[PDB]
């Protein structure tokens, strides 16, 4: 699966979200929504704002 780059820190604020740090390389799981993408960070999966990551490939 594709990788995305965290452009900002984001702290999860709902049970379906996940936290990321700027510079993190996240695995993209689902980009079907315009605003929230499902990613894998560490060993957690959840949603982060699509604007706060950049797809690499
Ligand atoms: N998290």
- Resolution to 1 decimal, in Å? 1.4
Spacing, Cα 55 to ligand 1 middle (Å): 20
The matching CATH number, chosen from 2.30.30.40, 1.20.1300.10, 3.90.190.10, 3.60.40.10, for 1-57 is 2.30.30.40
Q: Where are the domains of the chain?
A: 1-57
Closest CA to 29 of 49, 10, 47: 47
**How many whole angstroms from 44 Cα to the centroid of ligand 1?**
6
Q: Which of 44, 39, 36, 47 is nearest to 14 (CA)?
A: 47
Q: Do 35 and 17 form a contact (C-beta atoms < 8 A)?
A: no
Residue 55 bridge partners (DSSP): 4
Rounded Cα distance between 45 and 33, Å, is 16
Residue corresponding to tokens 């700027």 = 22
Length of the chain: 57
Experimental method: X-ray
Distance 18 CA to ligand 1 centre (A): 4
Q: Which residues, listed in sequence order, are joined to residue 41 by a DSSP beta bridge?
A: 44
Pocket around ligand 1 at a 6 A CB cut-off: 12, 18-19, 44
């Amino acid at each position: 699966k594709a990788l995305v780059l965290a452009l900002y820190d984001y702290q999860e604020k709902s049970p379906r979200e996940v936290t990321m740090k700027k510079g993190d390389i996240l695995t993209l799981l689902n980009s079907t929504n315009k605003d929230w993408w499902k990613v894998e960070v560490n060993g957690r999966q959840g949603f982060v704002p699509a604007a706060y990551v950049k797809a690499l490939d």
